[PDB]
Symmetry: D2
Subunit: 379 residues, 4 copies
C-alpha cells in the first residue's frame, strides 16, 4: 500500500494499469493522491473505481449483476436502501440486467446520494458502568506535634453526596490503584500502588500507623511521654508502608524468617518530600529483604508516579543509572542504623541484592493475600 | 521547638526545664531528638511528672484512679480490666487517690504486655466496591488506505479474561476517575480520555464512524479514494473526547448550532499517538471555530504523560512552554480550507483560546448532550 | 496580514488588491502563502508594479536609471557593472528615465546569472580566539579511609594531549563562561563550577587541602582515624566553589570575620556527585551560618543537569519544587554539632536564605578576595 | 577497607589485633568508628596508632629511630618543623635514640601541635587563562516582515568593554561550543554545537542565511517581490543550518554527489519553537543524506540541549523510543515536499537510513574543514 491505491480485498499486482496521470510524472499514484494538487481527482478516482469494479467481477466478463453492483456501493461507503436501490436499477438502463462499468461510473458520478433524511448514529454500546461513588481521601491533623496527642486522621468525602466518613488508611486505602477502564498498553503491565508516608524525606522523628487504635490513625512514636527519633541520622527518602498488606507472623519467608506483624514497608526514592501521613501513587521497582530480629522485614523500593524520572525507571537496574548511590545508601542506612544505639548490623537474604520488580510485586500480593485473611479471621 | 510538651493546656512559666539541658545550653527538644543519648530513667521521670500535673488541672497533688486510667491510655498503654484491677491493687490506694510517686513507681514496675498487643483494630468503612477493571484493546483490520480498514475496540476483562467489542465513543469513559482519589482535595479534577483520530505529523484523515455499529474508526474515503488534509499535516494529535456530543438541536455562543459530532480535542504534547490510540489528557483551554456555520469546538489538552504536562496549569502556560503553539494551531485551523478554494474560517470569542474552566464546562454540556442522545435513541 | 507589501512607506487606500484574491474573498497574503498555486506571471507583475510606485515617491511615472538600480538590488538582483551597462543598453532610455512597462519587459527577459552567484560574502569580524580547551581529570590515589588517599586534578590538553596537574581551587574556573554566549541577552549569567567534597547521602568528611601543593582533596583524619559527621549524613552534595576565599582580614554582615576557606555550596539536585567531582551549577540563594564566631556562608545551588534546574529561578522556587528542602538544610546546619556536646549554630539575616542576587554578590567579593590572596602570596 | 581502619601503606591482614572495643560488641571497627557513639575514640585511636607504629617498624624490634618517628608524624598529617622536631626529641626522653610506642603515644596525646603561627595556603597553580572577552550574541530584526526589506542581523556585545560589532552568523558563530575547561566526564565525548534556525517549527515561510550579502544576515526568500512559502505544508521542526560549515561543490560525497555550495542543514527535533534567526546549542544525533538535484543535501538531526528529553537521547536509535514517528515523518516530509509543485520524490543514500551520531559528526567536520579553506582561498 505504498505504490498505488487498492481495493482492500484480494487481487494480483501485475495487470492493474497505473493511472496515466502517474506514469507521466513518474510519481506513484499514492504520492499523487496524498501530496499532489487536486487535479488527480475525478479523473484519478475513475481508474481506482474501474479496478474495484474488476475486483467484484471475478468471472471477468465485463459487467456485474444488479446484485453485485449492490454490495459494491455498500463497500464504497454508500447507504443503499430500497428507495435508493430501485432508483439505481431505474436510472441504470440495462433491461437485460447486465451493467457495464462505463454505465456504472456515469451513474455514480451523477448521484452522490441523499445525505438529507436523518443522519443515523449507532448507539450500540456494551454499557458497562459502576454505581461506586468516587471518594476523595482527606487527611486531618489533630493533636499537638511531638506529644502523645498528635494524630493524623483519614476521611472519605463522597464526591456525589458530599458526605464524609472516617476510614483506616490501612484497610480502606486501596493497595492497587486501578482504573475502571485501563487505556495504557495491553503489553505494558500494571504497576500503580498507593503508598502511605510515615517518615518524611530528610527527617528523623518516628511516626507509625497505629495498628492498635480504631481507624488506625498515624501517631507519633512516644515512649514514657517523650517522642522517639532515629539516632543514626535522618531518613533520606520518604519511608512508610503500603496499605492493605500484612507481613503475618503465623508465616515463614525466604528460609526460616517470620513476618513482623506489620503492614509492609516501602521506601519512596523520589526527589519530593511527602508530609507525615501523606498518600500518593507509586511505581514498585524492587524490594530489599532485611531481617529485623529474625523477622523478615522487607522494604519495597518505589518511586512516586509524579517524579521527573519515574518514567525512565523501569526496573531496579535503572535506579543506579539515574539515581547513582541511592540503593547502596539505602542498603547501608538500613544495615547500620541500630549500631549508634549499641546494637549490631542487620542481615539480609538474597545476599542483600535488591530483588527486581516482579519479585517485589509477588511479595506484595502475598502480603495483600495475608491482610485479606486477617480481615476474615478477625471478622 | 523548646521543651517536651504534654499535648494539653498549661502555662509556659514555672515548668522547670530538664537540668540536663540547662547544663548544656541546648533546648530539651534539641537534646531529645538530636542528642545521641538515651533519655535516662531519671530524665523520663521529670517529663512523666509534668504530664501528671497536666491531668491534675485542679492542682490537688493526686488523680482519681479513673484519670490515671485515661493518662495511661494517653501514654500509649493498653488498659483493659485485668490491667485496671491490677493497677488499683498494686497502688493500693484505698481512698481512690493516686499520687505521682506511687504512680511512677507502679509504671516503672510494669512495662506491661508484649504479644497481647496481638490486638489489631479492624474497624473499617467496608467500602466493598468490586468490579472488573477492563483493559481497552484495539485491533486493526481491513487494508490501509482502502474502504475496509477499521480500527475496533474491545474490553478484556482483567479477571475472567473474557473479551467484548465496544464503542470507542459510548464505552470509553470521558472522565478518568479513581475509586479513591488520593490527589489533594485542593487540586481539582482534570483527567479526561482522548481518542486520537489523526496522528501528530500526518495528514491522512480518519474518524470515529458514528453511523456504523460499535463506531469503529474508519478512514475517510470518498468514491473509493482516501482523503487527506491538503493544506499540510496535522502537527498535533487530533482526535475526540469520547462520550460527548455537539448536538444540532442546540445553540452555542453566537447562536451557532452544534455539528452532530463528538467534540474535537487537540493534543499538544510531544509524543505522537497512533490512529485510534486512547490516552489520558489534561484539558487546558478551548478554541471556538465555526465550521460550515456550525459550532466546531476544539479542546486544547495535553497527554498526562508529557514531560511538561505538570508545568501546564491553564491556557496561559502554553505560550511559556510551548511558545508558538497556540498561534500556530489557530492559523492552521483558520486557513486549512483556502488551499482548496475555500475561505478563512471564523471563530467565536474573537479567536482567543478560552481557559480550562470554560473548556471543561463546554465539555460537560457536551457530555450531558451525549447522555440525552442515548435516552432518545434507546 | 492582508496584502503583499513593498517594505517601504505608502498609503493603504488606493492599492488595487490582486483581482485573483477579491474573486476568491481571501486576502492576498492568505492566497500567496496558503494557496497551492504558483503566482502566475500576471500576478507577479501587479506586485512588481506596486513596488516600482513605492520607489517613485514623486509619483512621476518613471525612475532614473540610478533608482532602477537600487530597486533591482532590493528585489535580490546582483547588479554589477557589466550588468548595469547591459540594462541601460536594453532599455535604451536615452534621457535616463525608465517606465515600468519598459522595466518589467526587461526584467522578464533577463533572470540573470545562475553560477556567477558563486560570490560569497566573506566579511567577518575575524575574532580568532584559539586556545586549548582542557579536559579536567581526577585520579584517586592512596587508600580510602587512611591518611594517604588523595584526589588529584589534571588538565588534558584537548589538542596536544599533554597532561598537567592543577589545583581544583585555583585552576578550575568559578565562572563557566562561553567564548560566544548564545543564550538571550535578557537572561543573566548563572553558571558556576562546583567541587563536591562530601557526597549526597554520605557522612564521611573530605576537603580541598588548602595547605598542600595543588590542593588535592584529602580526607579528614585526626590522629590516624578518619572523621565522620556524627549527627547524620549530608543529604545533598556539599562542596565548594573554586576560586573564592572567605578572608579572615574581612568582616561580613554582623561584624563577622571570614573563615579562611573557599566558600561552601550545597547542591540540592537529585543526583549524587562522587568525591572530588566537579560540575556546573546555578546559584539560587545563600545561607549565613556562624561557625565558630566566623562567617560561614553556604551557597544554595543546583546542578545544571537536574530535571528541575530549569524550573528554579531564585530561592523562592525551591519550596515549590523541593518542598521541605530549605527547612531541612537549615535545621541540619543549625544542630549538627549538638550531638557532640555542642550548641545550636546561629545565623545572620535571621536565618532566611537570601536570594541569588545577594548570593552572587557575596560570591563575587569572595572571588575578588581570592584574587587578592594570589597577589599577596605571589 | 570495610573491616577495620588501616595504615594506608602495605601490610598483612592476619596478626593485627582488632580493637577490643569491637570484638566485644561483634561490630567491625569501621562500623564502630563511623556509626557508633564517640566512646570508641581516644581508646580507639590508640590501637590504630599502635598498628601504624608497627607499620614503620618493619624490622619489628619495638621502636623506631628519631628519623622514622619524623616522617610518621608527617604521615599522620602533622606539620613537623625544626622548632617542633627538637621539641619532640627534647620532650621524648630517649637518650639512646630509641623510642617505644608507649613513649610515642603518650607524647603525641600531649601535644596536638602549634596550630597558631600562620596557617599556610599553597598557591601553586598552573595559571592557564585567556584574554578573550566573552561576547554576547545579539540578533536585531529590521525591515518589514514578508517583504524584501526584512532582515535579521547579528552582533557581538563585548561583555567587558560593552562595545558592539556586527558579525556573520555563518562565519563568526562557533560551530563547536567548547568550554575553556571541560568538566563533563573524560569518558563522555564532546557533543555540543551551535544551530541557527531559519525556518521556525510549525511554519511554512522561507528564510535563509544570505550567503551573498555582507555579514550574511537572514533574509526572507523573495522572488519578483513576493515571498516564498513551502507549499507541501509547514516545517514541523525547527529547520536551519549549522554555522561555520560548507558543503563544497568542488567536492564529491557518498558516491558521485557534489555538495550544494551551502552551509550544512540541521533539523531541531525538540518540542520548542525557535524564532527566525534564533541561535541555540544543540546535541547532534544523526544525519539523513538526501539528494537535492544530484547534489548531496544532508540534514543533521539534532536536539536542543534545553529540551526535556535531550538527556535521554544518546544516539539516533533513541529518537523512535522517545519521539516515535518523528524520523519517518522527517524522512517522508523531505522525500515528498516538491511533488505538490509537480516535481518528484527525492532520493537518498544509505537506503534512507538515518546514519548515527559518529557518522553525522564526521560529516560535520569535513563540512567545517571545507568552510575553513573557503575562508583562506577567498582571503
Ligand atoms: C521489643 C523491643 C523493641 C522496641 N523498639 C523500639 C524501637 N525499636 C526500633 C523499631 O521499633 P524496629 O526496628 O521495627 O524494631 P523502628 O521501626 O526502627 O523504630 C525497637
Ligand atoms: C466543498 C469542499 C469540502 C470537502 N470536504 C471533504 C471533507 N471535508 C473535511 C470535513 O469533513 P468538513 O470540511 O468540515 O466538511 P472536516 O471538518 O475536516 O472533518 C471537507
Ligand atoms: C570541639 C569539637 C570540634 C570537632 N571538630 C572537628 C572537625 N570539625 C568540623 C569542622 O572542621 P569545624 O566544627 O567547623 O571546626 P567543619 O566546619 O564541619 O568542616 C569539628
Ligand atoms: C535553479 C532553480 C531552483 C530554485 N528553487 C527555488 C526554490 N527551490 C527549492 C529550494 O530552493 P532547493 O530544494 O534547496 O533547491 P528550498 O530549500 O526547498 O526552498 C528551488
Ligand atoms: Mg518501637
Ligand atoms: Mg466542507
Ligand atoms: Mg569545632
Ligand atoms: Mg530558491
Amino acid at each position: 500500500a505504498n505504490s498505488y491505491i487498492g481495493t482492500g480485498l484480494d487481487t494480483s499486482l501485475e495487470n492493474v494499469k497505473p493511472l496515466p496521470e502517474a506514469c507521466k510524472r513518474n510519481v506513484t499514484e499514492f504520492d499523487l493522491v496524498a501530496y499532489g494538487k487536486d487535479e488527480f481527482t475525478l479523473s484519478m478516482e475513475k481508474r481506482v473505481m474501474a479496478r474495484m469494479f474488476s475486483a467484484f467481477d471475478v468471472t471477468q466478463l465485463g459487467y456485474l449483476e444488479e446484485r453485485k453492483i449492490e454490495h459494491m456501493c455498500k463497500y464504497l461507503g454508500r447507504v443503499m436502501n430500497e428507495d435508493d436501490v430501485k432508483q439505481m436499477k431505474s436510472e441504470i438502463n440495462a433491461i437485460d440486467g447486465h451493467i457495464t462499468f462505463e454505465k456504472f461510473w456515469a451513474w455514480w458520478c451523477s448521484h452522490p446520494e441523499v445525505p438529507a433524511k436523518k443522519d443515523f448514529f449507532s448507539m450500540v454500546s456494551v454499557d458497562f458502568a459502576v454505581p461506586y461513588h468516587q471518594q476523595q481521601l482527606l487527611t486531618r491533623e489533630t493533636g499537638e506535634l511531638y506529644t502523645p496527642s498528635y494524630r493524623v486522621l483519614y476521611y472519605f468525602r463522597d464526591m456525589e453526596t458530599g458526605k464524609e466518613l472516617q476510614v483506616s488508611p490501612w484497610h480502606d486505602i486501596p493497595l492497587y490503584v486501578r482504573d475502571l477502564v485501563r487505556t495504557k498498553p495491553a503489553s505494558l503491565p500494571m504497576n500503580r500502588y498507593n503508598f502511605i508516608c510515615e517518615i518524611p524525606k530528610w527527617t528523623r522523628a518516628k511516626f507509625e500507623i497505629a495498628t492498635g487504635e480504631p481507624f488506625n490513625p498515624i501517631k507519633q512514636d512516644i515512649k514514657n511521654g517523650v517522642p522517639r527519633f532515629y539516632k543514626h541520622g535522618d531518613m533520606m527518602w520518604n519511608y512508610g508502608a503500603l496499605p492493605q498488606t500484612w507481613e503475618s507472623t503465623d508465616v515463614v519467608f525466604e528460609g526460616g524468617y517470620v513476618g513482623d506483624n506489620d503492614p509492609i514497608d516501602a521506601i519512596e526514592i523520589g526527589m519530593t518530600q511527602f508530609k507525615v501521613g501523606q498518600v500518593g501513587a507509586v511505581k514498585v521497582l524492587g524490594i530489599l529483604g532485611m531481617i529485623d530480629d529474625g523477622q523478615m522485614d522487607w522494604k519495597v523500593i518505589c518511586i512516586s508516579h509524579n517524579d521527573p524520572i519515574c518514567r525512565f525507571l523501569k526496573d531496579i537496574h535503572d535506579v543506579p543509572k539515574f539515581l547513582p548511590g541511592c540503593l547502596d545508601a539505602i542498603h547501608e542506612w538500613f544495615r547500620v542504623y541500630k549500631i549508634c544505639q549499641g546494637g549490631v548490623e542487620n542481615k539480609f537474604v538474597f545476599n542483600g541484592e535488591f530483588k527486581d520488580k516482579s519479585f517485589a510485586m509477588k511479595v506484595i500480593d502475598e502480603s495483600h493475600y495475608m491482610w485479606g485473611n486477617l480481615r476474615k479471621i478477625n471478622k
